[PDB]
């Protein structure tokens, strides 16, 4: 059947994540009706018992679309630089006895705060995505994405920045995702507008 | 699974249930490899609301397995707002003053005799002209002209199916709208490359 | 329910293929947990009962990622060069009675030995993939692929070769996938190395 009761249903990640190697912030939600499973099965090949593997970290206030894929397990035992990509070490067969372990880690996959990931996007092992970034639907993200950068395609590539450099710097500095709730609640209208600078000047006089 | 076999292609009008999905006759979906009927091809389309973007598909379309039609516009996310988090749609009292981020994209309109390859994705608001071909796994972000072939992600121009004049002749004769009797009689001609023939034959019958 | 018991489960192809028109070499495996189904449903539209359709041939020691797609049945009855792409012939309506059969074969799909196919890659009908090739995840493979070539993207495009032209000459020549299993057992450390030249010299003498 289905983890989700409605197409329009978006459940917070911190109510469906079971894998100790997945670390999630508040409010970030996964919208998964079209692919059936909860968030855990978005995160592929991530051993939940091992402390020595690439981990997945997701900030707060993320929007994650249906069927998005986060690839873990690094090269999954396959070494293209070796004579064979075939994972002899992992096929239990008396003849593959002296095989070396091909498994190479790629680094953690870190998703910043306020990231919107489109439906069926695929994030490759070890990539870092900056706060406020947008990943177009069906993207295959193979390298790091800068804060507030919009990328898309396969492999994914620069489309544009959401805002000026000044505004990006103002956002990274004010880190509204970390405000007291009180402040957050007060600022809902500004957050639903394009007035980065007015929000910034305001925060400045309250906070500095 | 909703399809009895891999080769099983059921007409859209035998399976659509969403009032906001409008479909021609003959158009079929072969969705065996993705289990669900065609309704679930059409993502985020409210069936009750008369004020949201619609999906309109014409006659004689061939829609491949797990093709996707994205509705609901930006789905409440505003890239030009400070945050794309859809506060207005989240169940939280701290989000009471949020404004509504939803923006419609316009309707998605697929014309007649359009073939859409398996697992291709159609973005909100795109118009795809008559006789167009959308390659498998295409991500269709902009309108497709009549008899155009496009592919890739984002989908880009590959080819036209025919010359400008042939396209014109086909757009004028509009076989998909002929009386049923003419259609049955045109069967061998339609399974042919002979635009000019059929066109001249049509002219003497219809003008 | 799911064919595979764990995400880390990889079942050999030869233990899960029931379709006579799929020919699979030894040790090749499909790691299919995330798409639930056995390999048979990776292979799309291959009529099991007939001998006049395109077939799938896969070499030994291949590694196939979850949800890889092998498109069979050529043009599926749709003729872009014809007036309509609508498959009249294949639909039941008395009005389509005199339709011509639009089906056309594409040739076999042939994956060589030692091929790694990334998750959710799509191999188009009739393509040939050379030994030791790597197909990136989400590739849409519309053209043939050279031995030891790495491709990715949609449509797939040349990224690079894994080895020099000489080293590729040597591997094609020594074809270690055909060695008796006894030899392989002695060669494991060499196969988990970048030493093509070393093993080559070891093979001839």
Whether B82 sits inside 8 A of A196 (CB atoms) is: yes
Closest residue on chain C to A123 (Cα): C137
Query: What residue has token string 């980065």?
Result: A196
Q: How far is C43 from chain B (nearest CA, A)?
A: 10
The residues, ordered by sequence, that sit 6+ positions from B5 with a Cβ below 8 Å of its Cβ are: B32
SS3 C30: strand
- Among C27, C78, C131, C158, the active-site one is C78
Give the tokens for residue C126.
């009739």
User: What method did the depositors use to determine the structure?
Assistant: X-ray
In C, what residues contact A, Cβ < 8 A? 7-8, 10, 27, 29, 34, 61-63, 66, 114-116, 119-120, 132, 134, 137-138, 150, 152-154, 162, 171, 176, 181-182, 184-185, 188-196, 199
Q: Which chains are within 8 Å of B by 3+ CB pairs?
A: A, C
- Counting as contact any 3 or more CB pairs under 8 A, the partners of A are B, C
Classify residue A165 by burial, with Cβ atoms within 10 Å: 0-12, 13-18, 19+.
exposed
Peptide bond into A182 cis (omega under 30): no
C83–B191 CB contact, under 8 Å: yes
CA B203 to CA B173: how far, in whole Å?
8
Are C98 and B184 within 8 A, CB to CB?
Answer: yes
Token readout for A126 is 């070890």
Q: How far is CA A172 from the centre of its chain?
A: 18
Closest CA to B151 of B174, B121, B177: B121
Length of chain B: 207
Q: Give the domain range for residue A50.
A: 1-208
Neighbours of chain C (3+ CB pairs under 8 A): A, B
The catalytic residue positions of B are 77
3-state secondary structure of C146: coil
Mode of pairing for the β-strands spanning B156-160 and B148-151:
antiparallel
Chain B residues in contact with C87 by the CB 8 A cut-off are 9, 62
Query: Which of B21, B68, B82 is the best residue to mutate to test the A interface, defined by the most A CB atoms within 10 Å of its own CB?
Result: B82
Distance (Å, whole) CA B135 – CA B117: 5
The answer to whether the Cβ–Cβ distance between A86 and C8 falls below 8 Å is: no
Q: Please state, in angstroms and as integers, the Cα–Cα distance from residue B22 to each residue in B18, B156, C85, following that order.
A: 8, 27, 21
A106 is in an annotated binding site: no
Give the strands of the sheet with B21-23, arranged side by side: B21-23, B55-57, B108-110, B127-128
How far apart are alpha carbons A178 and C76 in whole angstroms? 55
Q: What SS3 class is residue C79? A: coil
Q: What is the CATH number of the domain that holds C186?
A: 2.160.10.10
- In chain A, what residues touch C182 (CB-CB under 8 Å)? 95
Choosing among C139, C191, C193, which should be mutated to test the A contact, i.e. which has the most A CBs within 10 A? C191
Sort out which chain C residues have CB atoms less than 8 A from A154's CB and list them: 138, 152-154
B128 in Cβ contact with B75 (< 8 Å): no
Integer distance in angstroms from the first to the last C-alpha of chain C?
52
Tell me if C88 and B190 make a contact (CB, 8 A cut-off): yes
- Number of structural domains in chain A: 1
**Do B191 and B175 touch, CB atoms closer than 8 A?**
no
Q: How far apart are CA B78 and CA B90, in angstroms?
A: 15
Place of tokens 């009706």: A33
SS (H, E, C) chain A: CCCCCCCCCCEEHHHCCCCCCEEECCCCEECCHHHCCCHHHHEECCCCCCCCCCCEEECCCCEECCCCEEECCCCCCCCCCCCCCCCHHHCCCHHHCCCCCCCCCCCCEEECCCCEECCCCEECCCCEECCCCEECCCCEECCCECCCEEEECCCCEEEEECCCHHHHHHHHHHCHHHCCHHHHHHCHHHHCCCCHHHHHHHHHHHHC
What is the DSSP code (8-state) at residue C191? Answer: H
> Tokens 């635009």 sit at which residue?
B195
Q: Report the C-alpha gap between C138 and C179 in whole angstroms.
A: 32
By the 10 Å C-beta count (0-12 exposed, 13-18 middle, 19+ buried), B21 is classed as: buried
């Amino acid at each position: 059947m289905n983890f989700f009761t409605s197409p329009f249903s978006g459940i917070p990640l911190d109510q469906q994540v079971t894998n100790p190697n997945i670390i999630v912030g508040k409010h970030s939600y996964y919208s998964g009706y079209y692919h059936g499973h909860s968030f855990d099965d978005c995160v592929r090949y991530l051993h939940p018992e091992r402390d020595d593997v690439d981990k997945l970290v997701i900030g707060s206030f993320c929007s994650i679309g249906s069927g998005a894929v986060f690839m873990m397990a690094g090269n999954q035992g396959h070494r293209s630089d070796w004579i064979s990509t075939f994972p002899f070490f992992y096929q239990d067969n008396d003849n593959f006895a002296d095989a070396r372990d091909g498994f190479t880690r790629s680094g953690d996959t870190i998703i910043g705060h306020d990231v919107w990931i489109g439906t069926e996007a695929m994030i490759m092992p070890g990539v870092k995505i900056g706060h406020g970034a947008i990943i177009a639907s069906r993207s295959v993200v193979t390298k790091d994405v800068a804060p507030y950068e919009v990328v898309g395609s396969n492999p994914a590539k620069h489309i544009k920045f959401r805002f000026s450099d000044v505004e990006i710097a103002m956002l990274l500095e004010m880190a509204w995702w970390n405000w007291p709730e009180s402040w957050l609640k007060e600022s809902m209208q500004s957050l639903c507008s394009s007035d980065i600078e007015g929000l910034y000047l305001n925060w400045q006089s309250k906070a500095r």
